[PDB]
C-alpha cells in the first residue's frame, strides 16, 4: 500500500514563524488531506483535497503539491497550533496516514532541579526496592541520567517517563526509576543519580548512603 514520510519528524518553533511540513508519498496519489491532533483528542480536519480549507480553520494554514510531493504551511505560527499533524491519503485502499510531525515550543535553556528519593521501608518489607530521580522543569528535553550503584554505571534496569511541554513555560519534567530486589539493594551503599544536560556546565550528582 501507499505510505507517506513526513518532514520533519519533530520541529521546534516560535510563535509567528513560517512552518513548512512535507509529505512524501511512495507512489502516485491524486489528493492529500491534513489533520491536526492534540493529546487525548480525535484529530481535526484542516485541509481537504490537497489545498482546500475546512470551515472554521484559520487562513494561516495552507496546502499544496501534486504527484508524491505535498506540503502544509503555517505562515504565522500561533499558540493553538502546537500539536501533531498528519497527512492523509483517501484515494487508494487501504486509506493511509502520514507518520506525523510534532510541532513544539522553542524557548531558552533551563537547567533541571535534581532530587533523589530512597525506597521507603514500607516498600522494602515487600521485597522490592525502588529508587527515584526527579528532573524538574528543564529545557530542552534531551537529558542524560546515569544511575550509579557504588560507582557501577547501571544500564537497562531503570525506566524513564517525561511530562509533555508545560503550557505556561514550555519546560519538561522527568522521573527515572531504578528497580532492585530488597536483598540486592542491601548489597550496595552509595546510590547516585547523575544528570547531564546542556544547561549544566558540569553533570549534577544527587546521592544517599543506604541507611539514612
Amino acid at each position: 500500500d501507499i505510505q507517506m514520510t513526513q518532514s520533519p519528524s519533530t520541529l521546534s518553533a516560535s510563535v509567528g514563524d513560517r512552518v513548512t511540513i512535507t509529505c512524501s508519498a511512495s507512489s502516485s496519489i491524486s489528493y492529500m488531506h491534513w489533520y491536526q491532533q492534540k493529546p487525548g483528542k480525535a484529530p481535526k480536519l484542516l485541509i481537504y483535497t490537497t489545498s482546500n480549507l475546512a470551515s472554521g480553520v484559520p487562513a494561516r494554514f495552507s496546502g499544496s503539491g501534486s504527484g508524491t510531493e505535498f506540503t502544509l504551511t503555517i505562515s504565522s505560527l500561533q499558540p493553538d497550533d502546537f500539536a501533531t499533524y498528519y497527512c492523509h491519503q483517501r484515494s487508494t485502499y487501504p486509506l493511509t496516514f502520514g507518520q506525523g510531525t510534532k510541532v513544539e515550543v522553542k524557548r531558552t535553556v533551563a537547567a533541571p532541579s535534581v532530587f533523589i528519593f530512597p525506597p521507603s521501608d514500607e516498600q522494602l518489607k515487600s521485597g522490592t526496592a525502588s529508587v527515584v530521580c526527579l528532573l524538574n522543569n528543564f529545557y530542552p528535553r534531551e537529558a542524560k541520567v546515569q544511575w550509579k550503584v557504588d560507582n557501577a554505571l547501571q544500564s537497562g534496569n531503570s525506566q524513564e517517563s517525561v511530562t509533555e511541554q508545560d503550557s505556561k513555560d514550555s519546560t519538561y519534567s522527568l522521573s527515572s526509576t531504578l528497580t532492585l530486589s530488597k536483598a540486592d539493594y542491601e548489597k550496595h551503599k552509595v546510590y547516585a543519580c547523575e544528570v547531564t544536560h546542556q544547561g549544566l556546565s558540569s553533570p549534577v550528582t544527587k546521592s544517599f548512603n543506604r541507611g539514612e
Binding site: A42, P43, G100, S113, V132, S161, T177, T179
Partner: protein, 209 residues
C-alpha cells in the same frame, strides 16, 4: 448535532474478543458509510475498514482482515467493530469516523487493553526528602488509569504526575510529585489522593520525611 459516541474502555485477555459500539446522532445513519481506525502507542493512525449501513457491505484493510469484523445496526443507529483473537499488540485507542468525503466527524475513541494481567490495586509509597520535592510512588496496578490529586484538590501548582510505565511484570507504575517550601516539612500536611477505579481502590497517603 452530528456527534458519535463510542462505548467505554475495555480490558481483555489474550485469545478473547471484544465488540466496540459507536452510536450516531445529527444525521440520517444510512446515508454515510461508517469507518474505523486504530491508534497504537507511538501514535500511528491506521485505517481498519468501513461498513455501509444501507447495503451491509464492508471493506477492510488487509492488515486487519484477520482481526476485525465490522457490522451495523440500522434500527439503533449504531455501528459495531468486533476484534477477535486479541493479543497484546491490539492495545490501542479505537475510533469510528463518518464516511462523507474525508473524515470530518470522529467518535471520542475507545481504549482497548489486551493483557494476561489481572485487576490489582496499586501499593502507594511515600517519596520523601527554599524548596524540597516530595510525592507518592503508585506501584503494581492494573489496568490503567490512576488519578492522583494533592490535599483533596487544594494543591495543583508544581504537581507533575508522570505517565505510567509498563513493567516486565505486566503491572503499571507511576510517580506523582510536587515541590514544597522546606520550612514546612515537619509541620505542613501533604496528602496523595490516589484513585484506582477499576479495582475500587482509593488511598489517601500523607507524605513526610
Amino acid at each position: 448535532q452530528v456527534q458519535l459516541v463510542q462505548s467505554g474502555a475495555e480490558v481483555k485477555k489474550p485469545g478473547s474478543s471484544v465488540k466496540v459500539s459507536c452510536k450516531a446522532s445529527g444525521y440520517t445513519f444510512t446515508s454515510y458509510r461508517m469507518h474505523w481506525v486504530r491508534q497504537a502507542p507511538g501514535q500511528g493512525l491506521e485505517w481498519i475498514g468501513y461498513i455501509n449501513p444501507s447495503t451491509g457491505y464492508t471493506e477492510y484493510n488487509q492488515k486487519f482482515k484477520d482481526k476485525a469484523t465490522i457490522t451495523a445496526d440500522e434500527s439503533t443507529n449504531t455501528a459495531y467493530m468486533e476484534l477477535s483473537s486479541l493479543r497484546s499488540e491490539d492495545t490501542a485507542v479505537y475510533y469510528c469516523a463518518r464516511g462523507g468525503g474525508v473524515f470530518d466527524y470522529w467518535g471520542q475513541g475507545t481504549l482497548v487493553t489486551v493483557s494476561s494481567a489481572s485487576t490489582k490495586g496499586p501499593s502507594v509509597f511515600p517519596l520523601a526528602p527554599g524548596t524540597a520535592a516530595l510525592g507518592c510512588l503508585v506501584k503494581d496496578y492494573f489496568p490503567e488509569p490512576v488519578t492522583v490529586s494533592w490535599n483533596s484538590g487544594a494543591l495543583t501548582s508544581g504537581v507533575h504526575t508522570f505517565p505510567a510505565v509498563l513493567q516486565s511484570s505486566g503491572l503499571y507504575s507511576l510517580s506523582s510529585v510536587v515541590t514544597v517550601p522546606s520550612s514546612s516539612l515537619g509541620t505542613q500536611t501533604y496528602i496523595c489522593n490516589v484513585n484506582h477505579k477499576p479495582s475500587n481502590t482509593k488511598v489517601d497517603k500523607k507524605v513526610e520525611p
